[PDB]
Amino acid sequence: GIKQYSQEELKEMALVEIAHELFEEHKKPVPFQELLNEIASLLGVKKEELGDRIAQFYTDLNIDGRFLALSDQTWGLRSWY
């Protein structure tokens, strides 16, 4: 439930929430670098937008309460196990 959104529409989506949906989309744990790639290209914007948001993504992702850091920075959802 994250692809049907438009560019500006995705822009105003909460960054950790985008990632949450990204994980239910993939159903696979995804490394930190790769999940950002997935997000940025899903949006009709440059990655650099989400670059400001990369820094803040460290902050926001580490204060979330549903995420899971699996192996080295492979994120996902603990709601699978």
Side-chain angles (χ1 to χ4, degrees), residues 19-28 30 35 67 75:
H20 180 269
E21 309 304 53
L22 184 59
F23 288 107
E24 266 305 294
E25 168 187 63
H26 284 67
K27 281 168 168 49
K28 290 288 295 183
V30 183
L35 57 77
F67 259 78
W75 295 92

Side-chain angles (χ1 to χ4, degrees), residues 1-6 10 13 17-19 21-22 25 42:
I2 192 63
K3 291 177 290 303
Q4 61 182 270
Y5 299 126
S6 317
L10 288 167
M13 285 288 297
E17 298 307 288
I18 302 177
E21 309 304 53
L22 184 59
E25 168 187 63
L42 182 58

Side-chain angles (χ1 to χ4, degrees), residues 10 34-47 50:
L10 288 167
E34 299 183 82
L35 57 77
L36 293 171
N37 279 268
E38 307 300 90
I39 300 172
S41 306
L42 182 58
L43 286 65
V45 300
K46 67 183 73 68
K47 185 183 297 73
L50 184 69

Side-chain angles (χ1 to χ4, degrees), residues 30-79:
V30 183
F32 188 85
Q33 296 278 209
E34 299 183 82
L35 57 77
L36 293 171
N37 279 268
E38 307 300 90
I39 300 172
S41 306
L42 182 58
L43 286 65
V45 300
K46 67 183 73 68
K47 185 183 297 73
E48 304 84 288
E49 310 292 291
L50 184 69
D52 306 277
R53 275 183 160 198
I54 289 177
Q56 178 49 29
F57 191 54
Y58 288 111
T59 307
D60 179 50
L61 182 58
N62 286 272
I63 60 179
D64 173 76
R66 312 104 79 197
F67 259 78
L68 177 65
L70 298 76
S71 187
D72 167 82
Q73 43 46 86
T74 330
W75 295 92
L77 304 179
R78 63 192 187 232
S79 319

